[PDB]
Amino acid sequence: MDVLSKGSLKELLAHLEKTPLEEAISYRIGTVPYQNVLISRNEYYNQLYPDTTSLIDGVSREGQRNVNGLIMSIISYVVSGSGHYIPNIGFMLLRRSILDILTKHDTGLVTNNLNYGIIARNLTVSKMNCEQRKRMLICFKLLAYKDGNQNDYEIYLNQNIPLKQIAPNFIPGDMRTVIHNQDQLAIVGIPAYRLTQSTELSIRDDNAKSYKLGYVDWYNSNSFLRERSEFNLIRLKDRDTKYGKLNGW
Amino acid sequence: CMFKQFRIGMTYALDPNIMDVAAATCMLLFRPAQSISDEQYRYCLQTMAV
Amino acid sequence: VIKPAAVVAGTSTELIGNLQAIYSRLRSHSDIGFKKATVGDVIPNSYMIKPVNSTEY
Amino acid sequence: QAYSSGLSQNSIISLTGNDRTVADGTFNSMIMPRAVIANEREHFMKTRIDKIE
Amino acid sequence: SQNSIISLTGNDRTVADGTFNSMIMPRAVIANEREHFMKTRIDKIE
Amino acid sequence: ANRATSAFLDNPHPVGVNYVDEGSRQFVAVAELLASKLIDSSRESDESNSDVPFVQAYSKFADDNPRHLRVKTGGKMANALTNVIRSYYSINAPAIVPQVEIDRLASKATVSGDMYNSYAIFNSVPIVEVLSPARTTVSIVGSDRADVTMLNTGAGAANITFNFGQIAETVILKGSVPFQLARLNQPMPAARFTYKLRPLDGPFIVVLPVGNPLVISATAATRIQVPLAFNKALVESGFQTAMNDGLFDIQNVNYYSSFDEFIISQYHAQDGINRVSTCVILGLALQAYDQMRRALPV
Amino acid sequence: ANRATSAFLDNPHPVGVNYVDEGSRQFVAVAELLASKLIDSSRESDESNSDVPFVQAYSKFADDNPRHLRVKTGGKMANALTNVIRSYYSINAPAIVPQVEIDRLASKATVSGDMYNSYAIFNSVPIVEVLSPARTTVSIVGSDRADVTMLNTGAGAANITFNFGQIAETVILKGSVPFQLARLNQPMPAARFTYKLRPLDGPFIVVLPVGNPLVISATAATRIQVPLAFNKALVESGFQTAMNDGLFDIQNVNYYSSFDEFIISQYHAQDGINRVSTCVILGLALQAYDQMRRALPV
């Protein structure tokens, strides 16, 4: 919910710096990812409604124990709000931030063998919307810069024409590029249209609307932080600053 | 009470007195927890501790 | 050959006919193969073209 | 001191790329050379074929 | 570690292709149909 | 044994899964509402002999006043409407329109993007399979009115099995000459010209006497839930406009003569109830495309 | 049969898909307008004793005041235009310029980004294929004017098939000696020097007698929608410049003698309708590059 609310590149990377990896990993068993299932949608149909479960749903799924599953759990958390079930990763890796895993070699995780095409296909890039594809491409660029695979990232964009048009423009080592970026990455937000307490047909759409309706409740909740009215009560370390720089950028 | 989105805030002196603590403990007791923000909640606890 | 023959066959007669039809074509091609060496020309060779310096993506 | 020959050599481009590790499920991974002495399955299969000849 | 048997792939259960550890990994001769076909031909020849 | 099937029911391509939430549904509804006013503004212009009713309608639709220099295109709403139409047809078509742009355009007018208020009747005749014995010829042709021509050259009468699926509600069969039809494991009645059948009843057996060919004309009626603003005349015209304008030219897609054939083909595919909702939204989008493009040709 | 084709029509490389939105098209139009004023302001300052007109024009274009000891390069606008030109030529070229810089530079002037309010005529001759029988030689030379030299060493007359595509509007055929040409399966007219042909009519059959060589000169005219500011002379010089400074040096691309050849070659691809829109924006950018670089050589 909090990760889906971020609407700018600066906010997204700032959230990932303060968020540990354990938030990406889920400890609920879930179900196997790719299955043709029948779900109940009584608002629309009397018969059961066919659908296919996927990894970018908002509900936890079972994940492979390899490094591929860990990266695929991080991206699903960013684009869908929930991760997958990969237990016994370890204290050392789980305490690191999401940005450290994606960008830093000191974590101890080796990810240079990853194939962006296979990861995108397993995440069902075809079913993703524009904001979801932009968020995943941000994760790919950070991984490419960590492994020195910038050339491979560009070629993968050349093969996929729709991905090249929406590819965010920022150098993963320079903070000046992040501040200038004006891409809108928000998935949930205050809706200008009429939003009703009604169900959706597919699993992805229904789960997304739950976060959208939950965010509205979160926005008016006491947990939400109102910068306009309570800026002085925020701690100085985590207070918003114009000259905000990620470490090493 | 009528509108849940509205919040109640409070500003205390640098050196809190018995009035500040009495006013802080009256708000936590007799106002909805949904009205009091988390940042305001910490501020009231800090005033009591000081 | 029985797998292509029985994939849509509904009767035993059709299955036998499918088997015989395939071997009529197969035997005809074997004749052409031998005649290619009989003439004075040189037969072409199958080949595969791959990039000189292949890229990952 | 290692022997240094001034022999002119052509530039060599690896299949692995700049990161020096091949990507999974790629055409380059399928055409990569792989050890024959270290692997037991291959070092056994080649001895059998050598004996047969 | 505690275990006397050490897997070629680490606790991450991932081995990069084209590396020495992956080259010496065992092969599924029965499950692979290329491998099964080759073994049968050599056996018949012998 | 030979099997004959309808040509338009073969291999329905997967439809898109984007732009089918509440926010995008209201965007299509707003476009339909505002495109209707664009057409109606032309009539109002004639009455007052002034272009100010058209200027007002165009400004709301395009967020910009029309100019005599350039051709009227419709602005950002037209670009968004064209792209969502492409995405609905095929899964391979990109979803290039941002959510924020859909968010802003859906706020122009007040509508509810509910696509299950009403129903519409679609007239495509689904013939999943016609099973015929040897020495008989069966030809199926047509979608709105399916003509099945059957000739048997054998010694005796042959039995032909008809399978109309399970989705269609009513199928009416009319023969050139009186014929006999009955369900499986039922007695065969006297020869009669017109049969009314329900496809859920089961496979149907037709006696084909030896001699002159027998032709059966089939008409079907299927009810599909659609929004109240649905107009089949405008949806059908929009389907032809989009096909001519090259909005459906994507790789590995099937093409259909009418929206009637398109919606029924996806209905009869495996897990076809998922496709019906998306195709209905595409129909409303095509209704807006027909009105917008007729007012502003390009 | 032997097949001969024009050299420039072979394998058009994919163009870039970036900077083709309405915001980026405005920036290209703005750059062309500000480059035109840079040329005019330099000439006015040359013919006067004051440098104020040039200082003001360069300050707006480059966002910096000119200095005596520093090279006048054009500043951020020059860098943005140079990189944007690189992206249009090839899909393999990266998209370096951020969208924020493009939007900010587009705010310097007030011009519509319309790219379809006018048209232009391009003179390349699209000979897609020439099919000739055995014992005949066919050679195709030239792009602006295509000369086909054909010889018949056979016993009898030979029929040669000419395919000019479906894009060009008018093709004018001139021969050294009178010859016979007609559409497929049509009676052949009397021999004459000149033929006016619509390429849509179909493949054309030419009767080639066995006597002497016959050379056919072809000229074609095709119409492509362009912005009103388009100037063919400035685009061609801008095309030649951008190739010289290496703006088109990128792997796995084709090279063309002129912008006329480049745009026609891409038009004849499978997705030619989609490609020409990007090439038109490239032409205007090349027009701005020509004027800007002539005023500020580096």
Query: Which two three-digit tokens encode residue F104?
Result: 């802003």
- The pair phi, psi for residue F207, each rounded to 5°, is -80, 125
Residues of C in contact with A159 (CB under 8 A): 57
Which of B6, B14, B27, B37 to mutate: most A Cβ within 10 Å? Answer: B37
CB B47 within 8 A of CB B20: yes
Cβ(G258)–Cβ(G236) below 8 Å: yes
Residue F149 to residue G91: CA distance in whole angstroms: 54
CB contact under 8 A, A202 and F104: no
G241 in helix, strand or coil? Answer: helix
- Is the Cβ pair F95, A130 closer than 8 Å? yes
Burial class (CB in 10 A: 0-12, 13-18, 19+), A50: middle
DSSP string, chain F: -EEE--GGGS-PPPPP-SS-SHHHHHHHHHHHHHHHHHHHHHHHHHHHT-SHHHHHHHHHHHSS---SSS----HHHHHHHHHHHHHHH-SSS---S-HHHHHHHHTSS-----S-SEEEEE------EEEE-TTEEEEEE-SSSEEEEEEE-SSS-EEEEEE--SS-SEEEEEEEEEE-EEETTS-----EEEEEE-GGG--EEEEE-SSS-EEEEEEEEEEEEE-TT--HHHHHHHHHHHHHTTSS--TT----SSHHHHHHHHHTSTTTHHHHHHHHHHHHHHHHHHHHHHHS--
**Nearest residue to G148 via CA among G132, G134, G133:** G132
Q: What are phi and psi of G192, to 5 degrees?
A: -155, 160
CA distance G298 to G279: 26
Interchain proximity E16–A110, CB inside 8 Å? yes
Q: Which of F205, F123, F201 is closest to F166 using CA atoms?
A: F201
Report the amino acid identity of residue F291.
Q
Contact by Cβ (8 Å): F4, F138: yes
Residue G87's closest CA among G243, G248, G239, G255?
G248
User: Are A165 and G94 inside 8 Å of each other by CB?
Assistant: no
Judge whether A50 is closer than 8 Å to chain F, CB to CB: yes
In whole angstroms, give the CA distance from residue G173 to residue G244: 35
Interface contacts (A, C; CB < 8 Å): 9
Which residues of chain A have a CB within 8 Å of the CB of E17?
Answer: 113
Contacts of G273 in chain F (CB under 8 A): 246
Q: What are phi and psi of F126, to 5 degrees?
A: -85, 120
Residue A120 CB burial class (10 angstroms; 0-12, 13-18, ≥19)? buried
Asked if E27 contacts E34 with a C-beta cutoff of 8 angstroms, the reply is no
Q: How far apart are CA F9 and CA F265, in angstroms?
A: 5
Instruction: Determine the Cα–Cα distance for residues F223 and F66; give it in Å rounded to an integer.
Output: 42
Two tokens, residue G81: 């235009």
CA A54 vs CA A32, F12, F88, F193, F288: distances in Å: 9, 22, 20, 52, 33
Give the integer Cα–Cα distance in Å for G52 and G31. 21
Q: Would the CB atoms of C56 and A152 count as touching at under 8 Å?
A: yes
Residue of A nearest to C56 (CA): A152
Nominal resolution (angstroms) = 5.7
What's the CA gap between A30 and A61, in Å, rounded? 4
Instruction: Tell me how far apart the alpha carbons of residues A231 and B2 are, in angstroms, rounded to a whole number.
Output: 26
Residues of A with Cβ-Cβ distance to E14 under 8 angstroms = 66-68, 110, 113
Q: Do chains A and C touch (3 or more CB pairs under 8 A)?
A: yes
What gap in Å lies between CA A164 and CA A159, rounded to an integer? 9
Question: Which amino acid is present at G164?
Answer: F
Interchain CB distance below 8 Å, D19 and A112:
yes
Give the nearest chain D residue to E27 (CA atoms): D41
Q: What is the 3-state secondary structure (H, E, C) of chain A?
A: CHHHHCCCHHHHHHHHHHCEHHHCCCCCCCECCCCEEEECCCCCCCCCEEEECCCCCCCCEECCCCHHHHHHHHHHHHHHCCCEECCCCCHHHHCCEHHHHHHCHHHCCCCCCCCHHHHHHHCCCCCCCHHHHHHHHHHHHHHHHHHCCHHHHHHHHHHCHHHHHCCCCCCCCCHHHHHHCCCCCCCCCCCCCCCCCCCCCCHHHHHHHHHHHHHHHHHHCCCCCCHHHHCCCCCCCCCCCCCCCCCCC
Contact D39 E23 (CB under 8 A): yes
How far does Cα C13 stand from its chain's mean position? Answer: 24
| Residue type at position G283 | G
State the Cα angle at G102 between G224 and A138, rounded to 5°: 110
Question: Cβ contact (<8 Å) for D26 and C57?
Answer: yes
- A118, A148, A152: residue with CB nearest D24: A118
Do G273 and F69 count as a contact with CB atoms less than 8 A apart? no
Cβ contact G95:G11 at 8 Å: no
